[PDB]
Amino acid sequence: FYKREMFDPAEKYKMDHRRRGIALIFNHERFFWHLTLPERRGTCADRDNLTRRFSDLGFEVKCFNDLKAEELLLKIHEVSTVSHADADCFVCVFLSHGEGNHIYAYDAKIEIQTLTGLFKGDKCHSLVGKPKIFIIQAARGNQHDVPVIPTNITEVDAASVYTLPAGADFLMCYSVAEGYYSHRETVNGSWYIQDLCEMLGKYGSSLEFTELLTLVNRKVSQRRVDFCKDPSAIGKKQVPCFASMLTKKLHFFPKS
Amino acid sequence: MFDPAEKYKMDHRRRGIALIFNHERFFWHLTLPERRGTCADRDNLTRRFSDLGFEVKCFNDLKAEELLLKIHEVSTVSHADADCFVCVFLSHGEGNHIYAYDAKIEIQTLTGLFKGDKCHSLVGKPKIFIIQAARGNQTNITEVDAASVYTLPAGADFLMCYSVAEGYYSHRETVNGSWYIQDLCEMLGKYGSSLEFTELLTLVNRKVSQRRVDFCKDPSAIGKKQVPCFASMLTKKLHFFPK
């Protein structure tokens, strides 16, 4: 027996490289005053949660806190230009505010297509044909703070970031879709990241990853705020989504 | 309790309605080119979705007012006895709009008719939109159109399926039909009644993105790759097992 080159409806990405790969986490808790954006209490919990879960799946996790845009671009360009020949895949997470096709760094916004474009085709040959997974927790910062230099509560932010696709073998994962609202607990973290991390821990090492993101869709879209705390948040449902350009099934079975 | 393998309940009396809006030519004032090959797509889709148990209704070259009337009529009948709902658009598009014969319609208007508060009997059921629409260029020939329609999400339990993503190109053969629709239909025919539907759409991503654009008959088209995508808001696994 051998596998002839016939179309296989069950084909999986090859995940038997020496290393799982790098997972970058860009964590943004506060912003330059000229941006008029509120701080994001709870994001440090998200960052730590994600680090534990992706480390357990075999990723080399690198976190960066509150980088300026020039610094962020430098760092992500450095990762896009090294060889990933010995890696299975690549993960990039943004924890911030966003608007349209932009995510905010500390001092300025950056276009999502600029960040994903660094990993397309022969800009990053050693990731061609490998999953490139971007996870974005970014929505509209509520701006009732001034344009001047300056307990567990749930903050509710309108969806603002477009659910953009990218190239072949990219998977773009969004905390919330247009017309819905993103939620973050100031001590426990974001609804989306909490539920993503819980599902990674329970099922990440077995379930196909888009099947796992569908579980996250279900968990998040079924959450509600306590009515006695913030009646304002009634009817502000959160529905995540993911935009898949993947071409094979993706698993994170423990590496041998 | 939470079941990591939970499936949509697909044991209703009927599979449900599949609507297909098929646009081959446009009012002259829109200055959009004809879409030869689209009738093949329509026929292919009708067969595949019929075989999966759907009640397929096709509409050719409706005006926007006619199209809105029809999709509104469908959104207000009871789907209580149905598993799910499918809507296919075969046209040109731009941004958040798809073209009818005489005018643009916003995708969010069309999907909004099937949100929970407007269509109670589809609550918690899959609502699947499949969009073959890109930028009209203003024997079997292959036409190549730049991506133009945003890969928009919708509400819970919607699945939005696009023939092409930003930066890539959609292809249509004047005899054989659209690349995306051909490969979607081949996969439906072979695996539609067994495979989880997003796993099937992933196969379609692979098939379409592997179609070679190295040596076209039209030198203009060289290197203009096609990559589809789908945006899922589903909350459970979706299968179309024979009823």
UniProtKB/Swiss-Prot annotation, chain A:
Impact noted for substituting S221A: Abolished phosphorylation, leading to caspase-6 activation
Positions annotated as active site in the UniProt record: H97, A139
Protein name: Caspase-6
Subunit structure: Heterotetramer that consists of two anti-parallel arranged heterodimers, each one formed by a 18 kDa (p18) and a 11 kDa (p11) subunits. Interacts with BIRC6/bruce. Interacts with RIPK3.
Role according to the record: Cysteine protease that plays essential roles in programmed cell death, axonal degeneration, development and innate immunity. Acts as a non-canonical executioner caspase during apoptosis: localizes in the nucleus and cleaves the nuclear structural protein NUMA1 and lamin A/LMNA thereby inducing nuclear shrinkage and fragmentation. Lamin-A/LMNA cleavage is required for chromatin condensation and nuclear disassembly during apoptotic execution. (Microbial infection) Proteolytically cleaves the N protein of coronaviruses such as MERS-CoV and SARS-CoV. The cleavage of MERS-CoV N-protein leads to two fragments and modulates coronavirus replication by regulating IFN signaling. The two fragments produced by the cleavage interact with IRF3 inhibiting its nuclear translocation after activation and reduce the expression of IFNB and IFN-stimulated genes. The same mechanism seems to be used by other coronaviruses such as SARS-CoV and SARS-CoV-2 to enhance their replication.
Residue numbers spanned by region Tri-arginine exosite: 18-20
Regulation of protein activity: During activation, the N-terminal disordered prodomain is removed by cleavage. Concomitantly, double cleavage gives rise to a large 18-kDa and a small 11-kDa subunit. The two large and two small subunits then assemble to form the active CASP6 complex. Can be cleaved and activated by different caspases, depending on the context. Cleaved and activated by caspase-8 (CASP8) and subsequently by caspase-3 (CASP3).
GO cellular component: cytoplasm; cytosol; nucleoplasm; nucleus
